[PDB]
Scaffold this active site. Structure first.
Site, PDB file in Angstrom:
ATOM      1  N   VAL B  78       0.998  -1.217  -0.038  1.00 18.86           N
ATOM      2  CA  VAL B  78      -0.069   0.013  -0.058  1.00 18.86           C
ATOM      3  C   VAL B  78       0.834   1.140  -0.162  1.00 18.86           C
ATOM      4  O   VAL B  78       0.519   2.370  -0.478  1.00 18.86           O
ATOM      5  CB  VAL B  78      -1.213  -0.111   1.299  1.00 18.86           C
ATOM      6  CG1 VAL B  78      -0.170   0.074   2.506  1.00 18.86           C
ATOM      7  CG2 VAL B  78      -1.996   1.237   1.258  1.00 18.86           C
ATOM      8  N   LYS B  79       2.143   1.326   0.457  1.00 20.13           N
ATOM      9  CA  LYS B  79       2.751   2.430   0.584  1.00 20.13           C
ATOM     10  C   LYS B  79       3.392   3.156  -0.765  1.00 20.13           C
ATOM     11  O   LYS B  79       3.568   4.212  -0.842  1.00 20.13           O
ATOM     12  CB  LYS B  79       4.162   2.036   1.306  1.00 20.13           C
ATOM     13  CG  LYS B  79       3.902   1.778   2.865  1.00 20.13           C
ATOM     14  CD  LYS B  79       3.150   2.688   3.609  1.00 20.13           C
ATOM     15  CE  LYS B  79       3.000   2.633   5.190  1.00 20.13           C
ATOM     16  NZ  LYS B  79       2.000   1.534   5.215  1.00 20.13           N
ATOM     17  N   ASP B  80       3.197   2.097  -1.717  1.00 17.72           N
ATOM     18  CA  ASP B  80       3.836   2.643  -3.259  1.00 17.72           C
ATOM     19  C   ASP B  80       2.764   3.985  -3.291  1.00 17.72           C
ATOM     20  O   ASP B  80       3.175   4.739  -4.008  1.00 17.72           O
ATOM     21  CB  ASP B  80       3.497   1.524  -4.205  1.00 17.72           C
ATOM     22  CG  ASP B  80       4.504   0.260  -3.482  1.00 17.72           C
ATOM     23  OD1 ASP B  80       4.909   0.476  -2.786  1.00 17.72           O
ATOM     24  OD2 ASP B  80       4.199  -0.569  -4.293  1.00 17.72           O
TER      25      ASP B  80
END
Ligand code: HEM
Ligand code: HEM
Lengths: 498, 498
Positions: B78-80
């Site tokens: 998700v951090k992308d």
């Protein structure tokens, strides 16, 4: 007697120029996914087409280079497509019934796709793969609940110990077991003919000058090349084969000493029945060094987390596409992800061990300080404390002597860790410890040992894993404490002094 | 003095019921990707919504359970999303210029997203992450060309050795360096508010009863919950926090002994400024055992190759969603993939070592033969041959004595490998060897040793790694040879005898 040769001549009566309506095969056109997928198997396909921006320019390619990034499938490989197709066709034929056992000889990527479909649908899955294949594939397969059997890497395909032979013997011993046999089952090349080719053509608007694909079973290149010759007949088809395979034409390209190579999932010692070589306009050979150099380069330059077979394919593409000019486009197929290769080409030690990296070229890329001694940092001898000391007395001594940190050492001379003033104060102020509490908690237990005579590059790698490096002699006395900040201050000081 | 507290109270004047037009923040609505992506960073977002089919039913959930599978982003987390958003806003502000250095404290997933954007765009990237984080993240980051610094896992955030403190000190030592500071930068929760919430609402057609999200920085839950309270105000927001974090409310849930846990990327010892806790309707605590049990279960049952934080989230969802009935839906957020955890919860040895698996429950799941001796196979003593023997003489002796295989042993008693008749004949018939050639190639060099007194389950694990198990004593004499086929024949014989 029950063994079916995987290298039998294709009986397929397809030829270029036949109307598509004459096919006996059942064909399934791509359909739009619903907003909510009923299971993860519907996340196979629709993989992105991505421009390669830097590498193509670096080797003087004038054309647009595009990558079909197949590692975005649910299992992370192109084989997830064929695994599903092979099952669904086997379901429609009534060959495969619920609760039957699936057995498959694979290089692992196909095994992963099939084990995933079996986990969802409730088939038992037994995978036969060569011992050469990485353990990360084993860990994913075992986590899916598959049973795993290995075969010697140098077993010839016609031997009973080849992965195909062992699979057939197991099928003969396991009731209600089926082999889908990706080497002969038309569902593989058909999966690529029906979907992957249509995706490539749609993404390129049907305008394409060159395709590069590495060949393991041939299903990808066969299916794509056939549909492309029908709809984009001007596209040249380039096959990639490792040194030590016999798939390339003409046979002069296959003259070689080495019989084994480190790249996984491409090349074989036989021609699979599903491979139609007559649709390949040219073959290129690739080696392991080319593959891993370009894979690491693809990661570091384009951000495509992919495997070695993708590296081999792009390493060929930068040569084959040199005949193309500006305004033209070459498409490369990238079969799988780094997840299967975390401890192989991603680990520098394995690359050195296999001889794919020389120390000279690495040193040419290393900073000026990389070849320098730890003693050049000057350092300072730290204060040490006993483990029986209290938190309060640690704060008192540290402030009074003006140190921010101390190694915890013992009467026996065992170094137990680090304590710091900042962390001791935060823990007391937060009520996490008492002044009378033992340092045992607040201690930082993890660190690495160094000698005064070690290099600064060695320190850097330790600092990629540990915060504290303690300088020791083999007297246990501590000569210094080093963090990433002390090295950075030294480097930045030196950058000012010139 | 330059340190900015990551736990400072939010100055955000947002409150429920405000018109969206009053926002001072620059907002970017989701746009359709072109057919060809210019680079891999455009493959961030549009992650699939998938139905959970078995696990929900197993724990008596009556509602539809849906998973937003964020591990399909380019970096696999998700951090992308937030990494890209944080960069692009910093680009528009003129704060970040080409060739500047990015520094970030992270649990690693955010580091991966930022290192990937830096590799594509040409920023230098320096990552500060706790020593507890898995090495697979380090290997991916190093392969992206990031520099890596570690910090002690038990360093309090207000200490100079916390990952935040070390990042700030480095920023003070590196010219033209910027910290994007995911804990305070509004671009994180805004990335989730603008896109992820719109994706969830579109996929569910705006009809949603419950959301479960694990909280590390809170950006995901804050952004989603705010937009959902505006557009789907009936949705209940459930926060997941590990034991040993202090994020949950009320404070009675945080009373605990252990201060450290094995799950990565969730929980903290401070409240990030970007976390708005007031929009969370209820908190649940989770532990490591729950997380890994459900992660392994999610892989084996649903085929979702995801990380431990996803396991914690679903382990909570099966409890929180028990109040919901049929025709309702609960959505769970699955933050990242197994790629970061290949050697941790995926490895059974690590799970045993950490005490998350007991041998009793494993034996309850093992087959009847799992606790049996190798001696029960009966076996047969093999013929041995010297390594100086020729290929032809090996074929002659094997056929004349009626054996298909022989261990190659030596005068000194060192076992060098295996030779088989099938492979010897195939290699001669293929012209790969001569009758006068040394067996040195055709030998199968890889095998594993066993005792007569070992268990059959041990054999099975060896056969997950090796084709040949040789039965030895610590006299080197060979008592037997075992493959996966001999074990299967024994089991199937026994299945007939009842
Ligand atoms: C007009 C188009 C085509 C026609 C008329 C055709 C015809 C046939 C026929 C009659 C067979 C024998 C059926 C059997 O013995 O099982 C066959 C087998 C096969 N075909 Fe097709 N085919 C066509 C297109 C294709 C395409 C496009 C592919 C792959 C992209 C393909 C791959 C195969 C394979 C792998 C087999 C199995 C070969 C074997 O069992 O030896 N065919 N085809
Ligand atoms: C009408 C809606 C909103 C208004 C009027 C508003 C207003 C503001 C204002 C005036 C600030 C101070 C600007 C600064 O000092 O940098 C701020 C900061 C911030 N806002 Fe918003 N905001 C709104 C919506 C949101 C939303 C939807 C989010 C996240 C989903 C958000 C997250 C933040 C964050 C993280 C900060 C930085 C906090 C800090 O610097 O202490 N805001 N907001």
């Amino acid at each position: 007697p029950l063994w079916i040769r995987p290298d039998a001549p294709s009986r397929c009566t397809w030829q270029l120029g036949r109307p598509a309506s004459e096919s006996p095969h059942h064909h399934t056109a791509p359909a739009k996914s619903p907003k909510i997928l009923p299971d993860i198997l519907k996340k196979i396909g629709d993989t992105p087409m991505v421009r390669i921006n830097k590498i193509g320019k670096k080797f003087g390619l004038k054309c647009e280079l595009l990558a079909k990034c197949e590692f975005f499938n649910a299992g992370g490989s192109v084989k997830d497509r064929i695994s599903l197709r092979m099952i669904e066709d086997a379901e429609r034929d009534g060959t495969l019934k619920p609760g039957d056992t699936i057995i498959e000889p694979t290089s692992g990527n196909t095994g992963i796709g099939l084990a995933l479909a079996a986990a969802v649908r409730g088939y038992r899955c037994i995978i036969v793969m060569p011992e050469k294949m990485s353990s990360e594939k084993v860990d994913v397969l075992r986590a899916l609940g598959a049973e795993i059997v290995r075969t010697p890497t140098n077993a010839r395909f016609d031997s009973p110990e080849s992965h195909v032979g062992v699979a057939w013997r197991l099928k003969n011993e396991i009731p209600n077991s089926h082999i889908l046999d990706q080497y002969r089952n038309a569902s593989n090349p058909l999966a690529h003919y029906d979907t992957t080719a249509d995706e490539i053509l749609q993404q390129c608007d049907g305008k394409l000058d060159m395709l590069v694909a590495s060949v393991g079973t041939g299903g990808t290149i066969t299916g794509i090349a056939r549909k492309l010759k029908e709809k984009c007949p001007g596209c040249r088809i380039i096959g990639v084969d490792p040194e030590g395979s016999i798939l390339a034409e003409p046979e002069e390209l296959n003259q070689t000493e080495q019989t084994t190579y480190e790249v996984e999932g491409i090349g074989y010692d036989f021609i699979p029945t599903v491979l139609d070589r007559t649709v390949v306009d040219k073959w290129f050979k690739s080696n392991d060094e080319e593959a891993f150099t370009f894979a690491c380069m693809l990661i570091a330059q384009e951000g495509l987390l992919c495997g070695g077979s993708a590296g081999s394919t792009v390493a060929v593409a930068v040569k084959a596409a040199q005949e193309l000019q500006e305004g033209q486009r070459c498409v490369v197929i990238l079969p799988d992800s780094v997840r299967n290769y975390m401890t192989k080409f991603l680990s520098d030690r394995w690359m050195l061990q296999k001889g794919f990296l020389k120390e000279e070229d690495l040193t040419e890329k290393k900073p000026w300080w990389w070849h320098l001694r730890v003693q050049e940092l000057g350092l300072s001898a730290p204060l040490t404390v006993l483990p029986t000391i209290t938190c309060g007395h640690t704060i008192e001594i540290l402030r009074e002597k003006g140190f921010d940190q101390a190694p915890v050492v013992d009467e026996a001379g065992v170094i137990l860790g680090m304590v710091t003033l900042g962390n001791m104060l935060s823990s007391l102020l937060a009520g996490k410890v008492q002044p009378s509490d033992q340092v045992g908690k607040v201690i930082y237990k993890q660190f690495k040992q160094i000698r005064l005579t070690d290099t600064l590059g060695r320190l850097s790698h330790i600092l990629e894993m540990d915060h504290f490096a303690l300088v020791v002699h083999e007297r246990q006395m501590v000569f210094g404490v080093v963090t990433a900040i002390d090295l950075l201050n030294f480097v930045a000081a030196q950058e000012r002094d010139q």
